[PDB]
Amino acid sequence: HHHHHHMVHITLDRNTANSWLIISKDRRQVRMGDTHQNVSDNKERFSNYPMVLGAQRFSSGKMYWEVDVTQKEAWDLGVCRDSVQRKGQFSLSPENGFWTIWLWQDSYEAGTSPQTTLHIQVPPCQIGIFVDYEAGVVSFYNITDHGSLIYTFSECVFAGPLRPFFNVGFNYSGGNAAPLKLCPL
Numbered sequence: 417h418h419h420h421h422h423m424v425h426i427t428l429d430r431n432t433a434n435s436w437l438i439i440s441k442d443r444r445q446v447r448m449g450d451t452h453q454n455v456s457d458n459k460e461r462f463s464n465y466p467m468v469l470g471a472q473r474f475s476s477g478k479m480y481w482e483v484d485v486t487q488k489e490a491w492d493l494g495v496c497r498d499s500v501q502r503k504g505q506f507s508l509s510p511e512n513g514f515w516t517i518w519l520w521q522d523s524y525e526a527g528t529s530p531q532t533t534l535h536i537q538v539p540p541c542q543i544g545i546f547v548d549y550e551a552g553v554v555s556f557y558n559i560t561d562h563g564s565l566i567y568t569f570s571e572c573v574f575a576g577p578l579r580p581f582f583n584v585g586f587n588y589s590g591g592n593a594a595p596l597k598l599c600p601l
């Protein structure tokens with residue numbers, strides 16, 4: 417792909433983070449802490465899952481960013497509506513305002529309802545995310561495999577401002593402690 421020129425500088429929004437997340441000083445890395453991280457509750461925080469939003473809101477244009485997923489067993493990545501549900505249980509689906517892919521139990525899947533199997537020959541260490549607001553497109557690229565396409569959501573009905581979306585995943589296994597990192601431009 418040739419989307420690199422729409423690169424945007426994404427930072428994480430502390431106030432939206434699940435209370436067990438640790439966001440780095442530069443707001444470019446997030447990982448799941450071994451306990452509650454000593455913050456007050458608020459109506460923005462994701463309660464049930466180790467999720468956080470980017471600070472940036474997008475309502476027009478073309479945007480591209482890259483995330484490092486090295487040595488993680490589980491994670492979700494993509495975009496979501498600014499008004500997505502924060503509290504309780506929910507599915508990652510376009511009907512609920514999410515355009516996402518994930519890794520879970522050695523398989524990659526797109527967050528359609530029901531979910532779609534992805535065909536990845538080279539497990540990615542870095543994922544590229546491309547949003548075209550006007551076209552209604554969210555695409556995912558395998559940076560480890562020379563930028564090969566992973567998945568395109570088309571005919572997206574965003575129905576609001578979009579925010580970058582992250583889930584570091586659970587660490588029940590002790591093998592998923594590694595952070596998500598926003599990669600340099």
Ligand SMILES: CC(=O)N1CCCC2(CCCCCC2)C1
Pocket residue numbers: 434436463464465466585586587588
């Ligand atoms: C180890 C692990 O991953 N756990 C156990 C502790 C609670 C959970 C943390 C993630 C935030 C939401 C609540 C679930 C899951």
